[PDB]
RNA sequence: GCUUGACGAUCAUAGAGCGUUGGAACCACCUGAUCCCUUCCCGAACUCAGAAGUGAAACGACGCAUCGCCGAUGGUAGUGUGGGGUCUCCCCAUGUGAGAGUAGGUCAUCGUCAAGC
RNA sequence: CCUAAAGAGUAACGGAGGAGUACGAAGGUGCGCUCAGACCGGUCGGAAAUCGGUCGCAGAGUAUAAAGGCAAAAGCGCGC
């Protein structure tokens, strides 16, 4: 895993506007907003 | 599979190489739980001297490792001069010349047979 | 007529015609055939002379088909022309014949109509022909 | 991530689901390709420094540039510039990239119900092609540039589409 | 019927042949096959011309009588002259009850007046083959076999899988994934 | 014409047959490429000669995968 | 002698394809990337530390001629020497003798060393 | 290269093509790797760009004509 050409790989923070928070790792740093998310979409369920 | 016969094609140049100079070989055979050296006499056919981790005085449960290497390393130097052989030409056999191989090799300089 | 659609050369020496024609010496499409008997070569204006003068005969049904193709070319020097100074240039394109090769097949017909119509063709060839049938071996 | 939850569910459910007398023949992700034919830039040839910037953000790990095999002068372009650039996922780092492109953005585009099965071959790798690249987190619509079909594409250890398909069946994919 | 009386032939080569069909008017023949070492025998060549013209000849069994030793056998091969078409040579197989022979069968096109592609299509009947090669053992060696088309319309093709051969009797090249076309029926050449 | 052209002979080919006597620095082939590959006992030079580095006598042995043709010396 | 590894002999009668089978050891897959070493990115490959699991894949062993590969006997073609003809081509005496095809074979045979009985 | 007659050589105002250069790396060495093409799946390209998989065995390549060669590749890449 060579080092020192990629950057900072840490777990930021996901909330989702419907109140569903998922922690997963990203090159974010800060704190997101979703709109949307995997628990709040009708595709998933099928309506 | 595909590493096996890679491998194997990475072992020919020097092979033959050291067949058409008529030569005193020392192969070296390296798996994942054990490591391996013969000195094969001139043109492959016949085996002067050998040692490895199976020998019944080494199962002892490290012999995938640098130092399970460095003793028989030291350990084919010894049979080699009971067959009167010095003078041997290294054969890697395709591995990197980097890990348990070359520690292999080092002992083998120290043990008294010169390449 | 009939001559290759293109060549690796343009040119051929003379060579030689010996032997015999183990290959192509069966009937291996039709029921009957016209087959050499003698050495000789065929200019491609022969073969298609003696081909309008055989389907002609017939008229009615029948399948024919041609076993050999023009495809040597010989040059010619023209007249009042020294020698030397090259080889000249193409006229027109023949086909080695050796004893014992099939030159013209047909099936559809009878026997005596294709016996009568491959005697028209054998007429404008410059060899020996005769008449075979097909045969297992 | 996602690791955690193949071998404690997936891996033993589809051990029987499938009838599969061992335990290793169960099908299993293995690498995950992402790559993108710029197609473009073949005489302006100034996105790639950019390109690589943009692909390297939705990653963490750092691209490496394609070139061209052939001439083919007819699509104006001959061997050795750059057309395209690719990026090769394993282990922790595909699984992790994975959930955020499974469901925290891909739903999150404009469309569709869900992906098409039928896009198989005949072992059973699974590619997705993509009109966008703006989906992803970690790049705001402002700073980015002229759009690029950014692809997607899954290596499984499948014998055929319809295990392939079954193993992407759970992972809860917008499949239909 | 087919009886064909040989001698044993010792002198070999090209000078021997040839001093055979030139002054004795004889022909150099073989018989291998079986479990036997091979046989070189003579035979005559007004003898063994005589029998070829007999339709059956080469998907028959034959008595062959050399000296006085009596043996069955199959006609294997055969040479002719490239121009005159007379036989030079001919080699024969043993016969073993036993084993299976592979030889070549001659075909009979029947009813061909009656076929549906003729008499309302007013198309032409074109034979493309005219015999096949079948393997079978001895005791169901058909002399001939029979291929009908009475039910052939115009522009229908017939395959060797179409033809049914009798029992026991196996079409060698349909083994081999090759069902090459035997007849069809085709638009008049004018 | 415009043909009347051709260059010099090279006088290549076999110059020691099997089992002639040989010594060192002898020329046994002459080639363009390897038509026969270096055995025992002999070197090969850069316009693919193949030259005796010892003494004995000429073998040419077809042997190996590839089914090459190799010329060595051995002693007699 | 029976099984597995390493190195050779010989280069398809030894290959390919299909099927059955091998884990006590050996081998292979396998776990992790801290430490040597590595990716024009990725512990994929190379490398290191291993002992939870499996023989799935790979490899080996064993069966089958469908393909591939070998392949007679006899005849034919060509051909050195001497002599003839109807001499662009052939024949005779003597010596030599294919290629193709046919009957039919083939799922190899050995050597050195080390480990399990 | 053929003529040129299975060692070498062998003529014609005989039949066909090239040369009068290039390269400080296109040389040396160590290490490492295999092409063309086909098919399937995949965003603007769609027959052909980059990509993943299977087959493939040299039908690719070789600075430049043709012939003879090329797995220890003589083909391709990197450090010194
Ligand atoms: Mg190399
Ligand atoms: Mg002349
Ligand atoms: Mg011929
Ligand atoms: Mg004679
Ligand atoms: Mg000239
Ligand atoms: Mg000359
Ligand atoms: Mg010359
Ligand atoms: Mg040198
Ligand atoms: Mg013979
Ligand atoms: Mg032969
Ligand atoms: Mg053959
Ligand atoms: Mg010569
Ligand atoms: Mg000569
Ligand atoms: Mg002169
Ligand atoms: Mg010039
Ligand atoms: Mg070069
Ligand atoms: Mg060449
Ligand atoms: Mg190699
Ligand atoms: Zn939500």
Redesign the interface.
Same mark, same amino acid.
């Given at each position: 895993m060579k080092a020192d050409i990629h950057p900072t790989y840490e777990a930021i923070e996901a909330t989702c506007s419907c109140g569903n928070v998922i922690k997963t790792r990203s090159t974010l740093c800060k704190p997101i907003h979703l709109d949307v998310c995997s628990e709040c979409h009708p595709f998933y369920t099928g309506k | 599979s595909v590493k096996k016969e890679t491998r194997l094609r990475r072992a020919r140049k020097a092979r033959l190489k050291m067949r058409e100079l008529e030569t005193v070989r020392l192969c070296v055979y390296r798996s994942s739980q054990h490591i391996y050296a013969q000195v094969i006499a001139a043109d492959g056919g016949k085996v002067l001297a050998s040692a490895s981790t199976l020998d019944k005085d080494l199962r002892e449960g490290a012999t995938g490792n640098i130092d399970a290497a460095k003793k028989v390393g030291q350990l084919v130097a010894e049979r080699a001069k009971a067959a009167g052989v010095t003078q041997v030409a290294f054969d890697r056999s395709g591995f990197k010349y980097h890990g348990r191989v070359k520690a292999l090799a080092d002992a083998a300089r120290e043990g008294g047979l010169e390449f | 007529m009939l001559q290759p659609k293109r060549t690796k050369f343009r040119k051929q020496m003379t060579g030689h015609n010996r032997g015999?024609? *183990?290959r192509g010496?069966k009937v291996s499409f039709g029921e009957y055939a016209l !087959?050499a008997?003698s050495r000789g070569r065929l200019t491609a204006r022969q073969i298609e002379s003696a081909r309008r003068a055989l389907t002609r005969h017939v !008229?009615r049904?029948?399948?024919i088909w041609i076993r050999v193709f023009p495809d040597k070319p010989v040059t010619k020097k023209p007249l009042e022309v020294r020698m030397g100074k090259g080889k000249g240039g193409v006229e027109y394109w023949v086909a080695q014949i050796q004893?014992?090769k099939v030159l013209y097949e047909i099936?559809?017909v009878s026997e005596e109509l294709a016996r009568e119509a491959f005697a028209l063709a054998a007429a404008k060839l410059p060899l020996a022909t005769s008449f075979?049938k &097909?045969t297992?071996? | 991530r996602l690791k955690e939850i193949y071998r404690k569910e997936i891996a033993p459910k589809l051990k029987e689901e499938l009838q599969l007398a061992n335990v290793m023949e169960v099908p299993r992700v293995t690498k995950i390709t992402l790559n993108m034919g710029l197609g473009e830039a073949v005489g302006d040839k100034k996105i790639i420094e950019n390109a690589v910037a943009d692909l390297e953000k939705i990653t963490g790990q750092k691209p490496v540039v394609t070139y061209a095999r052939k001439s083919i002068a007819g699509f104006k372009i001959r061997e050795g510039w750059p057309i395209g650039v690719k990026v090769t996922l394993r282990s922790d780092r595909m699984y992790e990239f994975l959930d955020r492109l499974l469901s925290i953005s891909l739903p999150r585009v404009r469309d569709f119900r869900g992906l098409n099965a039928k896009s198989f071959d005949g072992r059973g790798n699974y590619s997705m092609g993509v009109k966008e690249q703006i989906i992803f987190p970690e790049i705001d619509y402002d700073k980015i540039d002229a759009l690029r079909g950014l692809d997607i594409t899954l290596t499984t250890t499948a014998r055929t589409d319809d295990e392939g398909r079954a193993l992407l069946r759970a992972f809860k994919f917008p499949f239909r | 019927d087919f009886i064909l009386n040989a001698q044993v032939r010792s002198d070999l080569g090209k000078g021997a042949s040839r001093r055979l069909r030139r002054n004795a008017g004889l022909v150099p023949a073989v018989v291998y096959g079986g479990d036997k070492e091979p046989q070189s025998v003579t035979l005559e060549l007004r003898e063994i011309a005589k029998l070829l013209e007999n339709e059956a000849?080469?998907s028959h069994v034959i008595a062959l009588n050399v000296g006085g030793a009596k043996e069955t056998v199959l =006609?294997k091969?055969?040479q002719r *002259?490239?121009? !005159?078409?007379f036989v030079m040579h001919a080699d024969f197989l043993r016969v073993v009850a036993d084993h299976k022979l592979t030889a *070549?069968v001659?075909l009979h096109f029947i009813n061909e007046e009656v076929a549906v592609g003729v008499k309302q299509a007013g198309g032409? =009947?074109? *034979?493309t083959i005219?015999?096949v090669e079948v393997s079978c053992l001895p005791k169901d060696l058909p002399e001939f076999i029979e291929v009908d088309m009475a039910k052939v319309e115009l522009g229908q093709i017939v395959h060797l899988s179409d033809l049914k051969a009798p029992k026991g009797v196996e079409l060698v090249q349909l083994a081999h994934g090759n069902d090459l076309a035997v007849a069809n029926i085709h638009a008049? &050449?004018? | 014409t415009r043909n009347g052209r051709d260059s010099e002979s090279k006088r290549l080919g076999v110059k020691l047959f099997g089992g002639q006597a040989v010594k060192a620095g002898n020329i046994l082939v002459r080639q363009r490429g390897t038509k026969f590959h270096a055995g025992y006992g002999v070197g090969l030079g850069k316009d693919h000669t193949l030259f005796a580095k010892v003494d004995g006598v000429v073998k040419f042995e077809t042997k190996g995968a590839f089914g090459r043709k190799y010329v060595s010396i051995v002693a007699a």
């Open positions: - | - | 015999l024609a *183990h010496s !087959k008997t !008229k049904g029948g399948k004893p014992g099936e559809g075979v &097909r297992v071996m | - | 000849a080469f =006609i091969a055969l *002259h490239p121009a !005159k078409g *070549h001659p032409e =009947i074109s *034979h005219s015999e008049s &050449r004018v | -």
